[PDB]
């Protein structure tokens, strides 16, 4: 067993199999009378915002969710071969961090907003 954050130095191919371990550790349960009462509310609000963002897309209750947005805005300039076997998740965030605000909007307009409209007009008949 690797435990919490066990696959931090492992490659992407071995770190994607332990998402459940870090998924459950984001929600656990006057000095020291108002510290906890303000920390736990923030811990709940940080989780709720992420779960709402993951779900205004098409990915509601799945840990791995792959969509139909082309790989144009996020310029990795690197092929799948040396990404999932020669890089870790910490190095990935260093490369794609500027393009994580123009890729979070292509998942909300080009996907699951338009997509939810032809389905509403196809179950009409």
């Amino acid at each position: 067993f690797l435990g919490f954050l066990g696959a931090a130095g492992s490659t992407m191919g071995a770190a994607s199999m332990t998402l459940t371990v870090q998924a459950r550790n984001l929600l656990s349960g006057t000095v020291w009378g108002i510290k906890q009462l303000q920390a736990r509310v923030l811990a709940v609000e940080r989780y709720l915002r992420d779960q709402q963002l993951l779900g205004i897309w098409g990915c509601s209750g799945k840990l791995i969710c792959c969509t139909n947005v082309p790989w144009n805005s996020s310029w990795s300039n690197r092929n799948l071969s040396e990404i999932w076997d020669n890089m870790t998740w910490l190095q990935w965030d260093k490369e794609i961090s500027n393009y994580t605000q123009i890729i979070y909007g292509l998942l909300e307009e080009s996907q699951n907003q338009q997509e939810k409209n032809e389905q509403d007009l196809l179950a009409l008949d």
Partner: protein, 451 residues
């Protein structure tokens, strides 16, 4: 080549952040009926066993001089100290004139240290007064213009509170734990100067037991090193930055107060009492502390050997005593069983080093009206303690400082420093860091969603 955006949730990514930590206390002494100035009823019990997780291929950057944990610990300790003195007696009616005279009797030569003072004090009934006497140290009374007229030293700054007699000043270990969504990183590199990349990064659930020991010019009951004596500073070139030393092996120090005291209770109102020293039975002798000469010499030699590397190779290392200032910054101030000591550390830092069962008795002084945390307007009047007190401790560190050098070489003189309590806890919260877990990420796979 048919690559599409894929969303992953729960990826191991962290970023630096600041949060508020809470307690974790051992249950061995948690259930006892002894009150401490550092509260335990508001701290949750600790886990039965810690959970240590080792991280491979992870290289993080630490910085001991820009850590928020030290500031949070300082704020919590100050708040606990302020809260511990609320519910009980305030010594407002003690600002009266005094008729003080010399104690004499048995004086080994402490010639004028103790004074025999008499004054008028109120009683339980509002319209009656009583005449009592008490013994005061010379550091607490100030003459105002043989029975002369004296007054307390705090009677023109602030009327203060008497120390609650039901609480204790004994430090106890305290664990700090991060909230959900936050992790604590522990650097396990033995030879780490506190600043820079750490090869051995390890996820730790919380921290270990950190005792809030208050002392100046020395570190008492700290954490020892593992390989060699470690010297850590923020800027070794700058002479305005304190230098922290960590000892490989601890030297032993013994302190005692030879006088046998006697505490008497005086009622100054309805339900309020004042504790005074009535008589001293036996002989009157000075309080002192001792350090073994050979062990201290070996420790100082190791400190010099490990200090030579940073500065030069032929320069001489000289140790001198303090320069000047208040009594709290020029003396080794600590607490031994409830009595506050101010020892003279001048025979310790007195040597000159060349590149080519004796004991050291340190005289000490005791004060009852103190003013700590570098604040103005609040006291903590420690009542007298009956009997003879003794303490055995460990010296596991130093807080040195450097003077303005001349001729750029050929001499370096180091003298003890202190004054700030953040340097006491910077020496223990140096291997810890707080990070915030970010679990959402995007990566390119070859999925296309079914339409």
């Amino acid at each position: 080549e048919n690559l599409w955006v894929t969303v992953y949730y729960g990826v191991p990514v962290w970023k630096d952040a600041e949060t508020t930590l809470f307690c974790a206390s051992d249950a061995k002494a948690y259930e006892t009926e002894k009150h401490n100035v550092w509260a335990t009823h508001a701290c949750v019990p600790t886990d039965p066993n810690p959970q240590e997780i080792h991280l491979e291929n992870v290289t993080e950057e630490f910085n001991m001089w820009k850590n928020n944990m030290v500031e949070q610990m300082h704020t919590d300790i100050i708040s606990l100290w302020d809260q511990s003195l609320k519910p009980c007696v305030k010594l407002t009616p003690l600002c009266v004139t005094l008729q003080c005279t010399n104690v004499t009797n048995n004086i080994t030569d402490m010639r004028g240290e103790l004074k025999n003072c008499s004054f008028n004090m109120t009683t339980e009934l509002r319209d009656k007064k009583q005449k009592v006497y008490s013994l005061f140290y010379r550091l607490d009374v100030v003459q105002i213009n043989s029975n002369k007229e004296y007054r307390l030293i705090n009677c023109n700054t602030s009327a203060c509170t008497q120390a609650c007699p039901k609480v204790s000043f004994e430090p106890i270990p305290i664990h700090y734990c991060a909230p959900a969504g936050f992790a604590i990183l522990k650097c396990k590199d033995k030879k780490f100067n506190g600043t820079g990349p750490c090869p051995s990064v390890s996820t730790v659930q919380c921290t270990h037991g950190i005792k809030p020991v208050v002392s100046t010019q020395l570190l008492l009951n700290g954490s020892l090193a593992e390989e060699e004596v470690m010297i850590r500073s923020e800027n070794i070139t700058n002479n305005a930055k304190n230098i922290l030393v960590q000892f490989n092996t601890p030297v032993q120090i013994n302190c005692t107060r030879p006088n046998n005291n006697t505490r008497k209770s005086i009622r100054i109102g309805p339900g309020q009492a004042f504790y005074a020293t009535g008589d001293i039975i036996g002989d009157i002798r000075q309080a002192h502390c001792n350090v073994s000469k050979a062990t201290w010499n070996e420790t100082l030699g190791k400190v010099v050997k490990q200090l030579r590397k940073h500065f030069g190779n032929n320069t001489i290392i000289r140790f001198a005593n303090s320069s000047g200032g208040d009594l709290e910054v020029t003396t080794h101030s600590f607490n031994c069983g409830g009595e506050f000591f101010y020892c003279n550390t001048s025979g310790l830092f007195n040597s000159t080093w060349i590149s080519n069962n004796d004991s050291i008795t340190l005289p000490c002084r005791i004060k009852q009206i103190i003013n700590m945390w570098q604040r103005i307007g609040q006291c903590m009047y420690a009542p007298p303690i009956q009997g003879v007190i003794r303490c055995v401790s460990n010296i596991t560190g130093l807080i040195l400082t450097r003077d303005g050098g001349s001729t750029n070489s050929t001499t370096e003189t180091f003298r003890p420093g202190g004054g700030d309590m953040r340097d006491n806890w910077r020496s223990e919260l140096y291997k810890y860091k707080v990070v915030k877990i970010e679990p959402l990420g995007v990566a390119p796979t070859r999925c296309k969603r079914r339409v």
